[PDB]
């Protein structure tokens, strides 16, 4: 089956810069069947480039199509706030009939920001049910690449927590994360000290926020 | 100019008109015939690659037959009949298609619909190619649909006649 | 105007079927080929099935082969997609888009219909449980926890919708039990704690649940 | 599997080899070798190699016409090529040799865009239409800025063999340049 | 030969086929489109000046798009595609018309009917000129009538279909 | 005001200026000056004046081809003109000058009907199709007996400006003579 | 290219269109006219020898009329209009027919059906010849039948209109 490789998977720029989105195919495909799309999470995807080079109606002149053989490129001359979204390349004719790329993410490049870490103990109203939840808030940081580790009595726990990342803000252009550590009320009383270890690129040393039960 | 070669392979057939391709005109295939209802579009349409080959083969068939062989395979004849046999811009169009990375016709493979019972055949349209590889069948499925629907509309008119 | 009228979303248990429809608006429907396209949660774009104009040839992706049945009524100008024996991974948003594969023009999907929410899960409809998240001692952060609810979505506001600055309603995640859960937090000044009352206004449109939890520091 | 449930998709591939007696056939062997067949015992060899076969820079066509020793059929298709070449102003690359009817023409391609080597390569792609993209890089990419890695284009006469390896024979090539003849040529 | 360039501007339209003219292709005018019912006559008729310009603009649109720009605006390409894009005798006819003091077409101004409500458009026929002055509207009013009646007959067939 | 009470007469005028990158455009400024534009920075100037720009009666084309310094695009349209000229037997009127690529060709028109000046003027009317009747008297009156008051036809290269004053640009001119090429020319 | 000369002899007739041949255009014959229903096939069909002669005579009629006579019968004009008046391959086809001992058209004798009462005429098709002798009437009787049946089908449509 044909494999569409979109590079890079994450892209950081600013309005007015040149975006060079690539798309690699496993087989020497036909240029005439390559197409590019812009996907906004709120609505349906929009066709930008069809036939590798042709621009669809309503697509601004800044978008451009290029490529031949196995290397195809979508290039935006100068960026705009509306252009910051996801982009997909496609090819029709091989297996599967409609091949789709991975997903090139276009985000605004904010100056590096440090996450404001907060830890939340499980509420007593929740422990009455029979299950505890430990929330570790990471607020307003850049970039999105951040790692959260859970240490229970200075002992790491893996797989028992769930992360959640918000989208880049409209004004400050930062991200936020909320890793929720879920444990049983019987096992939450089995321990005493709980902490989440935050490691970010904009951190000189890994910050750890903790709390003692009771 | 405009092509003017008229082919005639009506001898010993159910209806006058129509052309047949001998098993020596097709690679790894037996002989195939096409009805007069189909070849009639060759006298009208100025843009069918398969019609230009029919006039080219019917010329090759008649030239070898009705003219004594030259001493050393003279090319003087075909150079003066080329404009009356094919279309010089139909091949020039496929050049530009190939030049613009668009699937073109290299005049080798042709496809056509053929009914499973009544045996009615369509006019063979050219199978396109780009970077030396034929298009998959799914690349132009809607073209077959438009061509398969033309069969139904053309079938309707005979009963209406 | 050239549009595609989508419809057919819903929730079903794994094993049941679901029909997707898509009507044609302002264009020759029988002239174009129809395709189905889905997007799994937090995943890339995927191709489901395709049926040519006139419905002569039908194609499917190896995943939904057998479970899915694409059909079209060129008289009604409508596209359909039956999803017999659905599974867990089939939950996604689905789209219907038209294409024309011909010698004359390249391959593209120009006209698209809006999203179709399909959720295939064995869990049942349950209201949310709102647990507070308060801090303890120049700005602090407090929030709510919307845990164990089904299905999506849930809207959360703060202080009757007046408080908007610094609010972060996080995307919901699906727990191992098959129940969604999210957290809505807001950054507030430390000088207002114990003085300004903070309440989160959670509304669960499924089951018509309206919970107002008071978040106060411990 | 069947279109409209009543129709079948069938195909046919034309055997171009039978047109040899009436018209020439063009086919390519590999990257370097390309062929035009005129009949069943005579042909012409188009080749692209970095090795030169003609050191001198002359082209005694007038003498070759007087001592008529070549085949008129092969002289027609070699005249068709050069006449199809547009913007031919560098006659230094034109090197020819016709000793006793043995025809052989060489083009010096080693010389940027629009050079004298451009119009020669353009004419070459049309001459061996079936499978000429193998000799160039990104053949569909351009038309005016057409270029190859080789430095010489040698066109010698040869005997007939089953040289059609990469592509099947086809008269579509030669029949196309008959209209481009004596056009875009300067005084 | 015979022209063979086929234009395709069917993307994002109600029906496949038809061509649109951008506001940069028309002087002092916004963009104008024409239905597939009208442009279909361009593939058939060998004598319409407006169809030859459509193939010339669709070539200019595709040539600039699908071929990297030459070093100094090379003319080698258009000289070999001119016979496959337009009709060399259609322009030669207008020469003879101008030579014989007969109103000719200088390929600039075109007229067409456009319904006031349903918006159906005819194929733009060329506005003639003689001694450097366009004909008044009344000079060919009966031509519009024959063309306006063709609209009614063409309208009738769709309901009959 | 409306035809058949339901239809409107609407018009459209093509903007030929956008075809400059693909094909040359012909337009005339006034009685004396006429222009062919090839691109957005290069052009050619056709002019009809009683003043001679070339006194000598030579035309070293072979030398100009060797020292390739001109633009091939402009050499094509100047070759198209002379090849389109029928019945060219008086090579004394042919005066050319190509010093360092600066192209310039002059035709001596001062010499009754069917003269060497006739075929040159006929080719000129087709070259600048949009608005060439201004240079002649009763242009539609005749075809073979075509004559002007001027004595010299000078064709120099020039830079691009908005010279299209009397008529709009048009490729209809140049595209017409491509078929008349190398016809009606004597041995 | 493709022929583009349009003839007009509609003045003082019952219907617009149609062409008439003066008694000086025909040897040993008076003047003969043909209806617009027949000459309309001249604008469409690319293979009728009689239509190429109509455009050649209507050119000779207009050239002598609208251009002052040259000094010594200049041929410069007809050489440039030949491709817009006739078909260079239609005559080339008849060469090959004569070359292959097949009955060809030497453009002199033409035959046509003419109703005995209503006076409707067909388009004059060319009378063939081989080794310098016209074919007997019986050589192509089935061609007349196919042409005489076309008259009935064409007659039917007017009542159906
Ligand atoms: C139009 O385009 C198509 C696709 O690009 C093109 O088709 C290809 O033609 C070549 C040439 O015939 C085929 O290659 C063959 O491959 C088989 C299997 O390897 C070989 O055995 C064949 O060799 C023969 O010829 C040799 C030299 O003459 C002999 O020594 C040998 O014994 C064989 O007889 C040959 O190389 C190729 O398979 C097809 N591809 C497809 C997909 O069909 C076609 O040729 C183009 N048309 C023209 C006119 O060029
Ligand atoms: C150049 O063109 C010429 C003419 O277009 C072409 O000549 C023809 O070649 C074919 C095949 O070699 C000849 O056909 C043979 O005809 C005899 C009877 O005359 C048959 O018996 C033969 O049949 C046997 O062989 C077949 C395989 O070819 C088997 O399939 C069959 O079952 C039989 O066993 C065969 O059909 C044909 O006769 C000549 N033409 C003439 C006028 O003689 C020539 O081949 C072309 N050049 C090249 C290199 O192909
Ligand atoms: C087909 O025939 C028609 C009619 O013969 C012909 O139309 C005419 O074209 C000319 C040239 O464009 C028009 O003249 C204009 O007049 C206005 C008003 O005076 C001027 O402003 C225009 O000048 C422009 O160009 C100058 C030099 O480039 C600039 O300096 C200036 O600022 C302007 O931009 C121009 O001279 C004339 O009005 C029309 N006539 C009609 C009735 O429309 C048409 O050109 C012919 N087609 C072709 C392809 O030649
Ligand atoms: C020779 O041909 C070439 C190509 O055919 C031609 O180039 C094109 O010129 C036009 C007009 O100059 C360019 O169009 C512009 O495109 C930009 C975006 O790319 C638009 O923003 C522009 O719009 C503004 O200007 C318009 C007036 O022109 C206003 O009406 C409008 O409201 C905007 O304010 C404008 O449309 C086009 O981009 C180029 N082509 C390319 C590939 O860049 C060239 O002009 C021709 N030569 C001559 C002398 O005309
Ligand atoms: C197309 O083919 C047909 C048949 O091959 C061909 O027809 C023939 O034309 C010749 C030439 O006109 C006819 O011959 C005539 O015979 C009579 C009777 O003998 C003569 O009187 C004629 O002579 C005239 O011309 C002489 C010299 O100009 C004069 O001196 C004399 O006084 C006459 O005026 C002439 O020789 C012949 O009868 C016909 N045959 C048939 C069957 O009609 C026709 O010419 C061919 N078309 C073309 C354009 O060549
Ligand atoms: C055209 O279609 C072929 C496939 O052929 C089709 O197969 C069915 C889906 C039906 O529709 C048939 O009617 C039709 O013929 C495409 O070819 C395929 O190429 C890919 C990549 O080159 C192959 O994938 C590989 O598979 C092997 C194992 O077989 C793996 O090891 C590789 O890692 C890779 O995944 C694929 O197998 C192959 N398909 C076949 C049937 O051979 C072709 O790409 C497509 N387009 C063109 C221009 O030809
Ligand atoms: C379209 O399809 C039909 C069938 O689906 C094709 O018809 C079959 O064609 C073959 C070969 O032309 C025929 O075979 C021959 O049979 C006769 C005896 O009848 C035998 O003497 C011959 O030697 C040969 O073997 C076959 O009879 C025929 N079948 C029918 C029912 O007609 C048809 O050829 C296809 N059309 C095209 C253009 O391929
Ligand atoms: C034939 O006549 C009709 C009306 O008599 C023309 O239709 C009108 O055309 C204009 C311009 O093409 C349309 O304007 C546009 O409106 C949209 C919003 O609908 C706007 O987004 C665009 O920017 C533009 O302003 C107008 O809507 C349209 N009216 C109708 C009822 O369709 C038609 O263009 C004429 N045909 C030709 C070939 O000129
Ligand atoms: C088809 O056949 C009919 C009759 O079978 C031909 O009609 C007749 O044609 C002649 C000559 O064209 C007509 O003669 C003329 O009569 C008028 C008076 O009406 C006279 O003034 C003229 O000087 C001339 O003598 C005759 O009237 C006419 N008869 C009828 C009934 O129309 C017809 O010409 C044939 N068509 C062709 C193309 O030959
Ligand atoms: C293309 O094929 C030809 C013929 O098979 C190759 O030519 C041969 O090259 C070898 C090595 O130089 C010589 O020994 C032979 O005498 C050549 N034969 C002929 C007939 O010329 C050629 O090398 C091949 N080219 C490529 C790029 O594979
Ligand atoms: C090429 O084709 C010709 C014509 O079919 C073949 O010619 C024959 O040659 C033999 C031996 O010289 C003669 O006995 C025959 O009389 C010739 N045929 C005719 C019709 O005159 C020739 O042999 C073929 N060459 C090859 C290599 O196949
Ligand atoms: C082409 O023919 C000419 C004419 O025979 C040859 O020219 C001769 O060149 C030699 C060496 O330069 C002189 O000594 C002779 O005087 C020349 N002969 C004449 C008649 O001028 C020329 O060498 C030939 N070229 C080739 C490649 O064979
Ligand atoms: C090109 O044509 C010439 C002339 O037909 C061929 O020359 C023959 O060559 C063979 C072998 O070297 C000699 O036995 C003959 O006597 C030559 N004939 C003549 C008339 O000189 C030459 O072989 C051909 N080229 C190739 C590559 O075969
Ligand atoms: C046509 O227009 C051109 C350009 O405006 C005129 O040429 C100019 O003539 C004057 C007077 O001789 C010179 O001073 C300028 O240098 C010329 N300019 C150019 C660009 O050549 C020309 O005279 C006009 N002709 C007519 C008949 O009006
Ligand atoms: C064109 O080129 C030729 C060749 O260089 C020039 O001819 C020379 O003319 C002068 C004067 O008549 C002689 O003294 C030389 O001997 C000639 N040279 C040769 C090689 O014969 C000619 O003058 C050039 N013409 C122009 C207009 O530049
Ligand atoms: C015709 O073309 C020539 C060559 O491109 C132009 O010559 C240039 O002229 C300018 C001004 O005289 C000089 O600054 C350049 O150095 C010249 N370039 C070369 C290569 O010689 C000439 O100007 C053009 N004609 C016109 C009227 O502009
Ligand atoms: C054709 O495919 C080959 C295979 O990799 C590639 O190298 C070449 O660049 C392609 N050419 C064109 C014109 O797409
Ligand atoms: C065109 O009109 C002008 C205006 O008087 C006139 O001088 C000229 O002779 C006319 N030309 C033709 C060919 O009618």
PDB file of C-alpha atoms in Angstrom, chain C residues 10-117:
ATOM      1  CA  UNK C  10     -25.937   8.882  16.338  1.00  0.00           C
ATOM      2  CA  UNK C  11     -24.760   6.549  19.080  1.00  0.00           C
ATOM      3  CA  UNK C  12     -24.970   2.755  18.778  1.00  0.00           C
ATOM      4  CA  UNK C  13     -23.710  -0.257  20.699  1.00  0.00           C
ATOM      5  CA  UNK C  14     -20.911  -2.307  19.081  1.00  0.00           C
ATOM      6  CA  UNK C  15     -22.692  -4.700  16.724  1.00  0.00           C
ATOM      7  CA  UNK C  16     -25.571  -2.458  15.684  1.00  0.00           C
ATOM      8  CA  UNK C  17     -25.885  -0.668  12.364  1.00  0.00           C
ATOM      9  CA  UNK C  18     -26.206   2.988  11.410  1.00  0.00           C
ATOM     10  CA  UNK C  19     -27.181   4.666   8.140  1.00  0.00           C
ATOM     11  CA  UNK C  20     -25.473   7.808   6.850  1.00  0.00           C
ATOM     12  CA  UNK C  21     -27.126   9.976   4.206  1.00  0.00           C
ATOM     13  CA  UNK C  22     -26.024  12.937   2.104  1.00  0.00           C
ATOM     14  CA  UNK C  23     -28.317  14.876  -0.244  1.00  0.00           C
ATOM     15  CA  UNK C  24     -27.338  16.811  -3.363  1.00  0.00           C
ATOM     16  CA  UNK C  25     -28.117  20.524  -3.611  1.00  0.00           C
ATOM     17  CA  UNK C  26     -27.773  22.545  -6.795  1.00  0.00           C
ATOM     18  CA  UNK C  27     -25.683  20.267  -9.002  1.00  0.00           C
ATOM     19  CA  UNK C  28     -26.055  17.290 -11.333  1.00  0.00           C
ATOM     20  CA  UNK C  29     -25.623  14.490  -8.803  1.00  0.00           C
ATOM     21  CA  UNK C  30     -25.517  11.610 -11.302  1.00  0.00           C
ATOM     22  CA  UNK C  31     -22.548  13.287 -13.046  1.00  0.00           C
ATOM     23  CA  UNK C  32     -20.052  13.025 -10.164  1.00  0.00           C
ATOM     24  CA  UNK C  33     -18.626  10.209  -8.070  1.00  0.00           C
ATOM     25  CA  UNK C  34     -19.289  10.083  -4.321  1.00  0.00           C
ATOM     26  CA  UNK C  35     -16.805   9.307  -1.544  1.00  0.00           C
ATOM     27  CA  UNK C  36     -16.953   8.836   2.222  1.00  0.00           C
ATOM     28  CA  UNK C  37     -14.232  10.121   4.551  1.00  0.00           C
ATOM     29  CA  UNK C  38     -13.860   9.882   8.334  1.00  0.00           C
ATOM     30  CA  UNK C  39     -11.530  11.286  10.994  1.00  0.00           C
ATOM     31  CA  UNK C  40     -10.971   9.256  14.158  1.00  0.00           C
ATOM     32  CA  UNK C  41     -10.630  11.270  17.387  1.00  0.00           C
ATOM     33  CA  UNK C  42      -7.133  12.712  17.613  1.00  0.00           C
ATOM     34  CA  UNK C  43      -6.148  10.977  14.375  1.00  0.00           C
ATOM     35  CA  UNK C  44      -5.366  11.845  10.780  1.00  0.00           C
ATOM     36  CA  UNK C  45      -7.704  11.861   7.824  1.00  0.00           C
ATOM     37  CA  UNK C  46      -8.989   8.518   6.526  1.00  0.00           C
ATOM     38  CA  UNK C  47     -10.805   7.197   3.461  1.00  0.00           C
ATOM     39  CA  UNK C  48     -13.854   4.995   4.030  1.00  0.00           C
ATOM     40  CA  UNK C  49     -15.501   4.068   0.729  1.00  0.00           C
ATOM     41  CA  UNK C  50     -16.315   5.355  -2.754  1.00  0.00           C
ATOM     42  CA  UNK C  51     -19.002   4.729  -5.376  1.00  0.00           C
ATOM     43  CA  UNK C  52     -18.725   5.953  -8.950  1.00  0.00           C
ATOM     44  CA  UNK C  53     -21.392   7.929 -10.762  1.00  0.00           C
ATOM     45  CA  UNK C  54     -24.121   5.568 -11.880  1.00  0.00           C
ATOM     46  CA  UNK C  55     -23.132   3.209  -9.055  1.00  0.00           C
ATOM     47  CA  UNK C  56     -21.388   0.634 -11.218  1.00  0.00           C
ATOM     48  CA  UNK C  57     -18.236   0.104  -9.117  1.00  0.00           C
ATOM     49  CA  UNK C  58     -17.935   0.299  -5.322  1.00  0.00           C
ATOM     50  CA  UNK C  59     -14.727   0.366  -3.278  1.00  0.00           C
ATOM     51  CA  UNK C  60     -13.975   0.105   0.436  1.00  0.00           C
ATOM     52  CA  UNK C  61     -11.010   0.465   2.759  1.00  0.00           C
ATOM     53  CA  UNK C  62      -9.607  -2.765   4.182  1.00  0.00           C
ATOM     54  CA  UNK C  63     -10.759  -1.740   7.676  1.00  0.00           C
ATOM     55  CA  UNK C  64     -14.474  -1.270   6.974  1.00  0.00           C
ATOM     56  CA  UNK C  65     -14.572  -4.021   4.350  1.00  0.00           C
ATOM     57  CA  UNK C  66     -17.693  -6.091   4.953  1.00  0.00           C
ATOM     58  CA  UNK C  67     -19.078  -3.929   7.743  1.00  0.00           C
ATOM     59  CA  UNK C  68     -19.830  -0.973   5.449  1.00  0.00           C
ATOM     60  CA  UNK C  69     -22.065  -0.787   2.362  1.00  0.00           C
ATOM     61  CA  UNK C  70     -21.959   2.356   0.205  1.00  0.00           C
ATOM     62  CA  UNK C  71     -24.909   2.984  -2.106  1.00  0.00           C
ATOM     63  CA  UNK C  72     -26.480   5.870  -3.988  1.00  0.00           C
ATOM     64  CA  UNK C  73     -29.884   6.781  -5.427  1.00  0.00           C
ATOM     65  CA  UNK C  74     -29.145   8.832  -8.541  1.00  0.00           C
ATOM     66  CA  UNK C  75     -32.884   9.462  -8.939  1.00  0.00           C
ATOM     67  CA  UNK C  76     -33.250  11.024  -5.479  1.00  0.00           C
ATOM     68  CA  UNK C  77     -29.776  12.621  -5.818  1.00  0.00           C
ATOM     69  CA  UNK C  78     -28.634  11.121  -2.524  1.00  0.00           C
ATOM     70  CA  UNK C  79     -25.625   9.199  -1.203  1.00  0.00           C
ATOM     71  CA  UNK C  80     -25.865   6.540   1.507  1.00  0.00           C
ATOM     72  CA  UNK C  81     -23.536   4.519   3.730  1.00  0.00           C
ATOM     73  CA  UNK C  82     -24.708   1.569   5.829  1.00  0.00           C
ATOM     74  CA  UNK C  83     -22.502   0.551   8.765  1.00  0.00           C
ATOM     75  CA  UNK C  84     -23.518  -2.963   9.776  1.00  0.00           C
ATOM     76  CA  UNK C  85     -21.745  -4.548  12.755  1.00  0.00           C
ATOM     77  CA  UNK C  86     -19.959  -1.452  14.009  1.00  0.00           C
ATOM     78  CA  UNK C  87     -16.948  -1.682  16.317  1.00  0.00           C
ATOM     79  CA  UNK C  88     -15.267   0.590  18.847  1.00  0.00           C
ATOM     80  CA  UNK C  89     -12.635   2.066  16.509  1.00  0.00           C
ATOM     81  CA  UNK C  90     -15.377   3.157  14.074  1.00  0.00           C
ATOM     82  CA  UNK C  91     -16.238   6.166  16.261  1.00  0.00           C
ATOM     83  CA  UNK C  92     -15.287   9.289  14.295  1.00  0.00           C
ATOM     84  CA  UNK C  93     -16.663  12.235  12.328  1.00  0.00           C
ATOM     85  CA  UNK C  94     -17.731  11.296   8.803  1.00  0.00           C
ATOM     86  CA  UNK C  95     -17.865  13.408   5.649  1.00  0.00           C
ATOM     87  CA  UNK C  96     -19.438  13.008   2.219  1.00  0.00           C
ATOM     88  CA  UNK C  97     -17.605  14.628  -0.686  1.00  0.00           C
ATOM     89  CA  UNK C  98     -18.035  14.513  -4.451  1.00  0.00           C
ATOM     90  CA  UNK C  99     -15.259  13.837  -6.952  1.00  0.00           C
ATOM     91  CA  UNK C 100     -14.859  13.446 -10.709  1.00  0.00           C
ATOM     92  CA  UNK C 101     -12.210  11.061 -12.055  1.00  0.00           C
ATOM     93  CA  UNK C 102     -11.918  11.613 -15.802  1.00  0.00           C
ATOM     94  CA  UNK C 103      -9.423  12.131 -18.601  1.00  0.00           C
ATOM     95  CA  UNK C 104     -10.430  15.813 -18.724  1.00  0.00           C
ATOM     96  CA  UNK C 105      -9.674  16.816 -15.125  1.00  0.00           C
ATOM     97  CA  UNK C 106      -7.507  15.655 -12.184  1.00  0.00           C
ATOM     98  CA  UNK C 107      -8.530  13.979  -8.922  1.00  0.00           C
ATOM     99  CA  UNK C 108     -10.013  16.195  -6.214  1.00  0.00           C
ATOM    100  CA  UNK C 109     -12.805  16.453  -3.628  1.00  0.00           C
ATOM    101  CA  UNK C 110     -14.067  20.005  -3.990  1.00  0.00           C
ATOM    102  CA  UNK C 111     -17.599  19.879  -2.525  1.00  0.00           C
ATOM    103  CA  UNK C 112     -17.916  18.653   1.062  1.00  0.00           C
ATOM    104  CA  UNK C 113     -20.747  18.197   3.507  1.00  0.00           C
ATOM    105  CA  UNK C 114     -20.539  19.114   7.164  1.00  0.00           C
ATOM    106  CA  UNK C 115     -19.422  16.698   9.865  1.00  0.00           C
ATOM    107  CA  UNK C 116     -21.419  13.635  10.930  1.00  0.00           C
ATOM    108  CA  UNK C 117     -20.788  12.554  14.524  1.00  0.00           C
TER     109      UNK C 117
END
